[PDB]
Amino acid sequence: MVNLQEYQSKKLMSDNGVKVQRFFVADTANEALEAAKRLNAKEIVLKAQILAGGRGKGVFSSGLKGGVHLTKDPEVVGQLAKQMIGYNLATKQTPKEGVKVNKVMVAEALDISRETYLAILMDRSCNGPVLVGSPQGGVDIEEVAASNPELIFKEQIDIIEGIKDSQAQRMAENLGFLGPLQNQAADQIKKLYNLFLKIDATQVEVNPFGETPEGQVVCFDAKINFDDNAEFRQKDIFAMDDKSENEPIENEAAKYDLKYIGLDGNIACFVNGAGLAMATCDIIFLNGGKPANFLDLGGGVKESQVYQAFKLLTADPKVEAILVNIFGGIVNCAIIANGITKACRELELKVPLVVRLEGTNVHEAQNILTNSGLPITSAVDLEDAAKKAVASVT
Amino acid sequence: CSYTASRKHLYVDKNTKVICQGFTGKQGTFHSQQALEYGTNLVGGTTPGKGGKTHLGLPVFNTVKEAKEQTGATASVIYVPPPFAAAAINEAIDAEVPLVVCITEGIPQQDMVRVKHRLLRQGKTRLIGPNCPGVINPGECKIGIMPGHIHKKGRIGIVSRSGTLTYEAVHQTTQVGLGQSLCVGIGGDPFNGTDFTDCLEIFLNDPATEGIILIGEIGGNAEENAAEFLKQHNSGPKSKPVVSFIAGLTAPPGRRMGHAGAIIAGGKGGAKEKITALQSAGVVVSMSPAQLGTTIYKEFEKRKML
Ligand SMILES: [Zn+2]
Known part of the structure; x- marks a missing residue:
């Protein structure tokens, strides 16, 4: 979102x-200063602009404590801003090393x-x-x-x-x-x-x-x-x-228009269809495994989307297996099987793939997957696919 | 007069005559061809500004009203891009096309809230979608994007908020020989023209539908409303077997799970609550999406309906 x-x-x-x-946003300590002056406020609030919460009690790498400060003195706003901009703000809600603060908001402090x-x-x-x-x-x-x-x-x-x-x-x-x-x-x-x-x-x-x-x-x-x-x-x-x-992966997936949502598991999976993807995540859990992600390639199921999906799951170091389950879409299975084995060879994936392809040209699809020489298991249905993917990881 | 009155237009059949809006576009073109191959009575389509052309050997019209009058179409399927899709649906509603199926994914929510506003105040036009795969009466009429070959005319009515999950249920009910009476994909959006109770009503009154599979997922309360409808209409003296699967048991709260309507927001819309609501309405919930066919099959066996 x-x-x-x-x-x-x-x-x-x-x-x-x-x-x-009323407020202004500043890029520099100096702009923070002039902005505090322009406000003409009895009291000023200086706030670091990061998306994570917990700013109030966070800490900058400059040593400054607190991402939100109040003051009646414009020059203090400048001095404090200088100890914020360019530094990393860590809070109980950001990664450990904090988030670089590039901007601060200087606003009039109003009582509620x-x-x-x-x-x-x-x-x-x-x-x-x-x-x-x-x-x-x-x-x-x-x-x-x-x-x-x-x-x-x-x-x-x-x-x-x-x-x-x-x-x-x-x-x-x-x-x-x-x-x-x-x-x-x-x-x-x-x-x-x-x-x-x-x-x-x-x-x-x-x-x-x-x-x-x-x-x-x-x-x-x-x-x-x-x-x-x-x-x-x-x-x-x-x-x-x-x-x-x-x-990062979340972002990457978005470049290529893919609905990617990371989870904490080790069984990656891609499916065409939001429902089917949720159901796959679900059936993997029902069968004792932990999905690594939710990924919807959509119903328009293109070979390049399959390839991008593999490229994406390459970025996740937790992935120990990939469950591919594709059923639907105007593209026949043999073309999907092709992009899969091509992705595998070229991106040099070494993890086992559990593949469930259903649709047009499944026979040839099954052939392409079998003769690929790749560690690929072809599943009977979804349950079989989940059980086999779960059997493939620690 | 009342929107619930158009529920019956959901039941497409061999006599349904269909036009395509967004007919000359890449998607409209491709599915229209598949529709013709399937045997669906596709009789033409519209694309504003391209009327007077033929496409796929059929007439193209500038407006739905002209298309409807010249062909007698009773259904329209929309493949128009999102920026124009709400206008496409409104045009069909104004033309009083009995059934409009909007396949289009990506229509702004605000746009659909407006469409639904008009929709609820008329009773000539039944809308299924948006963001849905369509409806199919096996061997008689296919309106939409589902693969036609996995279907087999039979006894199970299927309603679903998900396309791909429907293909699972059809494939499974076809394998156990039950087949399907009518399959309706109501789509993945939050605001849409047809919910589960609309379909359940048709299914409960349909002699050909002896069992029902209901497929839902996280988000909204359409499933919970369907459980209420069933408690009132399917708990005796009449009772058809109803099996369900609800996707999203393990979905993280607060994320749109692919489908714009698949989200647990404000702690509302979770899967467990939907399962519980259905069970209490007499529904047999299959915890596994791979077992819908066998689950409904046993229900039939128990009832000695095989
Ligand atoms: Zn998953």
């Missing part, structure tokens, strides 16, 4: 009328007098966008749902008519905003809904959605999940996608 830095999703919100803390939870999401169950909110802010909405379902409020929004003033006001009132603040929040809700539609979000979650003592309604923090299918019309947003904190 698309991953935005805090500064990026806040920019997205502010460029769209949503109220967020009240915290509520506000979310807008495409809900399958309601056939459309739902406004979900709770007076119980700053906490995971799931916990609140377990402990106090009575405090979770939902408004199903009609996609054709849009959000109604009535709906926004009622939600604001339900989140406990009062007097002028209720109209301000109701208004921020409408802007969030528009934002949600404009960027093809499947979910915009503001937590906390709250107010400052000076009576301001502010989206202090937000997480946005985007609809991958909308990429063709959200090019600028997807371009901002930060892949600097993703598992």
Whole structure:
């Protein structure tokens, strides 16, 4: 999915009328300085921009402790930024050596007098966008749902008519905003809904959605999940996608358009079909093994996708065997068997392959696999394939 | 008037006449050819701006309305690229084509929420998909992308959120000689035109469908709704054997597992809950996807239905 830095999703919100803390992003200690000055704020928050959590109590390789600092003095922002940029920030949530910090956000520090939870999401169950909110802010909405379902409020929004003033006001009132603040929040809700539609979000979650003592309604923090299918019309947003904190193979697979998800097993597997891939991961587990990954080559099953898949699984050093299960797709099996033995020879894979091919030209397919001289076992069906792959690893 | 009223259009057969939207494109072209080879009554297709041409020896039209009037098609299959697919479906709905099968994968969710909004407020058009393999009545009518040769006309009705997993179930029920009455792939997207209960209703009322295989996976609550429908309609006095397999037991939460709708989000949409819900509705859940055929076979044996 698309991953935005805090500064990026806040920019997205502010460029769209949503109220967020004023802020600038800096590349250099010096820019951090000038930015702290431009803010004209009583108090400033300096935050390292990395995607991982635990920044607050993380540690830089410069020795500086804390990825989030508060100060009233611009020059301290500059000095601290100098001890952040270019260094690695490690938190209880990044690899051991931390993540290089290339940018810092310098923002006005606002006090939060009240915290509520506000979310807008495409809900399958309601056939459309739902406004979900709770007076119980700053906490995971799931916990609140377990402990106090009575405090979770939902408004199903009609996609054709849009959000109604009535709906926004009622939600604001339900989140406990009062007097002028209720109209301000109701208004921020409408802007969030528009934002949600404009960027093809499947979910915009503001937590906390709250107010400052000076009576301001502010989206202090937000997480946005985007609809991958909308990429063709959200090019600028997807371009901002930060892949600097993703598992390399995950990234590589994406270059070649493959749905790759790493797991901690040693039996690699590739399948054409999301369902079949999930089922394969499942049946490997049912049979006592640990899948190394989920990989969907899709139903358009091309020889080059098979080859790229093998190239990808070459990067994982944990792989001890590969279960190939292909059934479906417009390409006959003999062409798939070909790309397999070619991949094997050329990428010089030495691990056993358990292959299950079903479809057109299976006979010839079985022949190509048998005469390859490669350590290839041809499975009867899926269960047989799982049992044989499991029998092939430690 | 009511959308549930169009449920019956799901049952394609030898008399179903089909047009292809996105007919001149590479995918529309390829499956149209396979459809003709299978014996499906493909009677033409549309591609805006290419009307007045023939393609694959059939007429091409600029609009679904012209195609429908000139051929009497009662079904449309859509292979249009995602940016135009919602317009393609809306056009078919406006033309009141009884059955629309949208194969297209990749349509924006927001686009489908809009389509579904119109869809639910009319009852002439039944939509299956998007992101689905289609529907097939073995030996009579194939609309979509499934391999035709593994199918065998018979007694088991199959409904599934997954294409490839359906091929498993068909291959297995064909091997044990049961065969299939009708196979419907409702697709992998979160917002779509036909759910499991829509198909179950058709299956429960169909004399030719003596048993049912339901294939689901993580995400949403379509399976749980199907278990409710069955508790009400298939728990006596009427009762057809229903077997199921639910993919995703071991899926990691929070990741879209290939299918845009295959995701455990907010701790909701997990596999175990779907299995439990089905079992309590009388469904026999096969834990293994390799055992669907044999599981439903034993159910038939137990009931002395062989
Ligand atoms: Zn797997």
